[PDB]
Design a protein around this ligand. Structure first.
Ligand SMILES: CCCCCCCC/C=C\CCCCCCCC(=O)OC[C@H](COP(=O)(O)OCC[N+](C)(C)C)OC(=O)CCCCCCC/C=C\CCCCCCCC
Ligand SMILES: CCCCCCCC/C=C\CCCCCCCC(=O)OC[C@H](COP(=O)(O)OCC[N+](C)(C)C)OC(=O)CCCCCCC/C=C\CCCCCCCC
Ligand SMILES: CCCCCCCC/C=C\CCCCCCCC(=O)O[C@H](COC(=O)CCCCCCCCCCCCCCC)COP(=O)([O-])OCC[N+](C)(C)C
Ligand SMILES: CCCCCCCC/C=C\CCCCCCCC(=O)O[C@H](COC(=O)CCCCCCCCCCCCCCC)COP(=O)([O-])OCC[N+](C)(C)C
Ligand SMILES: CCCCCCCC/C=C\CCCCCCCC(=O)O[C@H](COC(=O)CCCCCCCCCCCCCCC)COP(=O)(O)OCCN
Ligand SMILES: CCCCCCCC/C=C\CCCCCCCC(=O)O[C@H](COC(=O)CCCCCCCCCCCCCCC)COP(=O)(O)OCCN
Ligand SMILES: C=C(C)[C@]12C[C@@H](C)[C@@]34O[C@](Cc5ccccc5)(O[C@@H]1[C@@H]3C=C(COC(=O)Cc1ccc(O)c(OC)c1)C[C@]1(O)C(=O)C(C)=C[C@@H]41)O2
Ligand SMILES: C=C(C)[C@]12C[C@@H](C)[C@@]34O[C@](Cc5ccccc5)(O[C@@H]1[C@@H]3C=C(COC(=O)Cc1ccc(O)c(OC)c1)C[C@]1(O)C(=O)C(C)=C[C@@H]41)O2
Lengths: 532, 121, 289, 28
């Protein structure tokens, strides 16, 4: 368990013993065996340090390049670079998650990743180690993108190896550099429409726990590719979507405005042009409701978000589903011959109109208003209502008990005191209630305590929120645009098929096996003349 | 910010007038009463016996909390940031306005420039 | 040496180093006696003195004092069991950190006067933070939640028996033969019993601590409020036994206090605590003056 | 409640203890 498979070789390697590690294998010790235990597993419940189960993985993750090089080229028993532990994470996976997103650690991990990759390619040109996935079925590139390891992701995406013998390893190819301009070609082999997981598809669908997701899209190839997609075909599809929803809202509003008021539902289709238009409008509304209902259900089946992160990352999807739900309930109650379809219909309609703030995500300047309204309703208001309701209920039970002998019912006390909270009350003190002085003291205390202290406390807190999420507007907008682009691309398969996501499909190098390799590419350019 | 506010106002006012089509009689008057709700000059009377009273109360309390408290103070914080930004650098703000004023005054009257002797010597 | 410290990097380092040197030398001279157990007139050890006076440097030194020298091991406070890698198991003495005597590091840091500068950052020291988290996770958490639940029930009963107070006649009221009347009298008794409990709790707290008049409100806001609620209910019951209608005027005060006092239990959550703290400072610093 | 060392007087000392762990690998 704790020491399962653990040998003195592990201690010597972890103690940076150059000779002892050599002596263990020289005697005949086999490194192919691995040690697994609660201490070695990646469990936050108890202390531990996951360096991988393979002894080669341990040596690599422990910053010992000479020792790992010796093990790989060891005559007695070379370590298998392709070995996978019980979890599935091979050496490259282990190096990926061992990163901690610091300049020193990221530089070290990337450098040693390069060294091990070059050495393995020299040993085994036939096999490529970056295509092997773990139990979760995601490659080291996908692992780095998903876990927020921005350093490793930035390394792998734009990995350029100048060495003539190691060219197929390079990801980015520099076509030419006339001057400050330097044309470059990126591989894009597994960045878009690659498999059930891809760097873009994984960054977009993070849980918001990832720290660098906002700054993850800044990496050159991804930003260029997203901008190209937006400018190519996504933009007009988004504008067509916004236009059709604007028309649907206009028809929904008109058919809701002119609802017949005589009799009980259903209503016999009167023989007129106006009646025909009204029934057509109702049908259009309900069809939109079914469309949004199925869209929401299929989204919830695909993603299957956790309950805690159902509102942090799926606010808009929840709101569209709720609007569809209210219309569906309204039509059910209209087929059930009740007058209560309108009460649900107004909810559905006001939701429908205030939901065009979803499409403000498509502009750079107008996005923040749709983002603020979200955080300010989930962080501040939600938890401040607990603090406010103890005040309201305590003081209202107090007030109604005092003068049980405007303030007649507990409901009316609640309403009058809420208007006191939001500055719409009137301290009349006119009718001769019993214990008038105590009544005055209670309500003056209430005004000072809630109207002045609490309301301005909330206002300052929301101002801090606005200040916080208004400074970094570009980051806030870019991720919303990324998710929009991904969803538009996924909605229509032929859209992606004819979009030609990659810039080109060209063969730019020759593999060590001697067979020409054809790969996708996406030319980019940049300007930097301060380096001469 | 008026774009952000008008979706709210129109959605909630179409909602309100549709609810009680059976102050809040006309869409114009709904728009006016709800604008005064936005700027803190409304009155939540809840007096006349409109149909579906509970839904009416829920709608307007949602409207007050959503616009009067959330949106109005959002705008106020944004304008305070603007004022803070363009109040720190007052000298720069003023000097360019003075420069344009001087240029226009000089250009208005040709003899003014001719006898102004722009150059020292 | 403890009080001569001034809480600066240079001075703290110097004082700790010379403290170590004198301790080692004295141990060499007199292994039989241990100098850290002798208290002053106030009856608190140098460790307790450093904790009480805010000397975070000296406290941090003494709590995790590790001496590697083979001849000087009993002096060490913290023992490092092993270090396989980034993990390094450690064993801290805890000999006089909790339930030690009439004074202890935790019991002294908690009961500071708010004049101490480092009290907020004093609990960050490794052994104390770990020990407090362990206590919270072990048995304190469920006792706190049971306390909050019982007070929530007491507030519900107090509210219900206050809502349905009889309005005909003068107090007292003859116990009518009914289920509703029986429930009402039971509710009244439960309310008054809670009042006596809170009254005695407050009195015993004030006797134990005996806070200074100036720091009666800075550090005992919640205790003052619970005592005031208990007082108002006690006066209400006195006036209800004195056959006056003026018990309700005190009862509403007592009840609104009772409900707004559940902000005391918002201290148990990380996110919700600040609202209960703001309301305090904003009522004592700003509004008062 | 364990005894982890021997006093200079030669009598074993039994003291309370509270095991803890920490992570710091930047120092190697
Ligand atoms: C007259 C209207 C007839 C009915 C048209 C459809 C209902 C109205 C409507 O709302 O139109 C829906 C779609 C555009 O929906 P969307 O992609 O903007 O929704 C995305 C929502 N989200 C981002 C939360 C997933 O219109 C379309 O498919 C148009 C398809 C061709 C017609
Ligand atoms: C029905 C209620 C019957 C009466 C129960 C007691 C009165 C109601 C109540 O309020 O319950 C009090 C205690 C919990 O009081 P606490 O520790 O939360 O007060 C701490 C206050 N402070 C922090 C300011 C010191 O409940 C208990 O002892 C419960 C004891 C077993 C019953
Ligand atoms: C995209 C374009 C969408 C713009 C659409 C509509 C905007 C224009 C409305 C002007 C209509 C005036 C005539 C009038 O009031 O008489 C009505 C006939 O009119 C109707 O019933 C037509 C409503 C159906 C609209 C669905 C469009 C979907 C097509 C795709 C009959 O009487 P009434 O006056 O309803 O009764 C009093 C009702 N109020 C005044 C109390 C409310
Ligand atoms: C834990 C659970 C706690 C939840 C408890 C109570 C909540 C439920 C209250 C519903 C009672 C309706 C019946 C009613 O009004 O008739 C009353 C009988 O009812 C009572 O007197 C019962 C009140 C005692 C509650 C103490 C609980 C402690 C037990 C442990 C008699 O008439 P009345 O209507 O009082 O007279 C008009 C009074 N108003 C309307 C003007 C105010
Ligand atoms: C600052 C608040 C100043 C308001 C004090 C007086 C309020 C109105 C008032 O006096 O009500 C009149 C008298 O009522 C009283 O005497 C009650 C006095 C209580 C005032 C103290 C309130 C302080 C609470 C703040 C927290 C109404 O009856 P009448 O006019 O005597 O016939
Ligand atoms: C905080 C808001 C507190 C206000 C709640 C009650 C509003 C006034 C009210 O009860 O209206 C009376 C009753 O109306 C109702 O019962 C509606 C209750 C709906 C209240 C819920 C609102 C929450 C919305 C916030 C977002 C008017 O009719 P009557 O007096 O029964 O004759
Ligand atoms: C699912 C949730 C949270 C929600 C659904 C309804 C009930 C909602 O009240 C809330 C609770 C609430 C009520 C009143 C004030 C604050 C919060 O917030 C929204 C929800 C809160 C508002 C504001 O909605 C927005 O934040 C606009 C918006 C911003 C960003 C978006 O990406 C977005 O995508 C659709 C929409 C609009 C309502 O949906 C609406 O139009 C009415 C009549 C009720 C509002 O419940
Ligand atoms: C002992 C003091 C200071 C105090 C007792 C009463 C009279 C009090 O008014 C004050 C004076 C006052 C009155 C009005 C506005 C501001 C201040 O403040 C509290 C006191 C002020 C409020 C607010 O109380 C709070 O700050 C909640 C609270 C926060 C943090 C806590 O740890 C806490 O523990 C119980 C309670 C509630 C009252 O007790 C209440 O419920 C009513 C009806 C009177 C309020 O006197």
């Amino acid at each position: 368990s704790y020491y399962k498979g653990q040998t003195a070789l592990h201690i010597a390697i972890e103690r940076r013993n150059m000779t002892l590690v050599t002596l263990l294998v020289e005697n005949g010790a086999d490194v192919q065996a691995a040690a697994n235990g609660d201490f070695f597993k990646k469990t936050k419940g108890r202390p531990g340090f996951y360096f991988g189960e393979l002894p080669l993985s341990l040596a690599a993750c422990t910053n010992q390049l000479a020792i790992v090089k010796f093990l790989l080229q060891n005559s007695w028993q070379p370590a298998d670079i392709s070995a996978r532990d019980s979890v599935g994470n091979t050496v490259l996976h282990a190096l990926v998650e061992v990163a901690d997103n610091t300049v020193d650690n990221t530089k070290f991990v990337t450098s040693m990743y390069n060294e091990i990759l070059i050495l393995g390619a020299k040993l085994h040109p036939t096999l490529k180690l970056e295509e092997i996935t773990n139990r979760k079925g995601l490659t080291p590139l996908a692992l780095a993108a998903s876990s927020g390891k921005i350093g490793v992701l930035a390394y792998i995406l734009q990995r350029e190896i100048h060495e003539p013998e190691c060219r197929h390893l390079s990801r980015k190819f520099t076509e030419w550099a006339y001057g400050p301009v330097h044309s470059s070609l990126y591989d894009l082999s597994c960045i878009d429409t690659c498999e059930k997981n891809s760097v873009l598809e994984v960054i977009a669908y993070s849980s918001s726990e990832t720290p660098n997701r906002h700054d993850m899209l800044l990496v050159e190839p991804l930003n260029r590719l997203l901008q190209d997609k937006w400018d190519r075909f996504v933009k007009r599809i988004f504008y067509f979507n916004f236009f059709v929803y604007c028309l649907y809202m206009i028809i929904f509003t008109a058919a809701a405005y002119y609802r017949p008021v005589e009799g009980l539902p259903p209503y016999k289709l009167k023989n007129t042009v106006g009646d025909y238009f009204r029934v057509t409008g109702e049908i259009l509304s309900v069809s939109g409701g079914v469309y949004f209902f199925f869209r929401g259900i299929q989204y919830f089946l695909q993603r299957r978000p956790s309950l805690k992160s159902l509102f942090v990352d799926s606010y808009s999807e929840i709101l569209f589903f709720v609007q569809s739900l209210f219309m569906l309930v309204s039509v059910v109650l209209y087929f059930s011959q009740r007058k209560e379809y309108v009460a649900s219909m107004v909810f559905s309609l006001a939701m429908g109109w205030t939901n065009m703030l979803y499409y403000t995500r498509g502009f750079q300047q107008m996005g923040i208003y749709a983002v603020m309204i979200e955080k300010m309703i989930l962080r501040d208001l939600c938890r401040f209502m607990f603090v406010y309701l103890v005040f309201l209920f305590g003081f209202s039970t107090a007030v109604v008990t005092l003068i049980e002998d405007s303030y007649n019912s507990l409901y009316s006390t609640c309403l009058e005191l809420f208007k006191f909270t939001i500055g719409m009350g009137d301290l009349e003190f006119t009718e001769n209630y019993d214990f008038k002085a105590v009544f005055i003291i209670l309500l003056l205390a209430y005004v000072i305590l809630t109207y002045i202290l609490l309301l301005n406390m909330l206002i300052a807190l929301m101002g801090e929120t606005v200040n916080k999420i208004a400074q970094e507007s570009k980051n806030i907008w870019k991720l919303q645009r990324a998710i929009t682009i991904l969803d538009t691309e996924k909605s229509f398969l032929k859209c992606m098929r004819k979009a030609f996501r990659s810039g080109k499909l060209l063969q730019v190098g020759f593999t060590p096996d001697g067979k020409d390799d054809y790969r996708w590419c996406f030319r980019v350019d940049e300007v930097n003349w301060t380096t001469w």
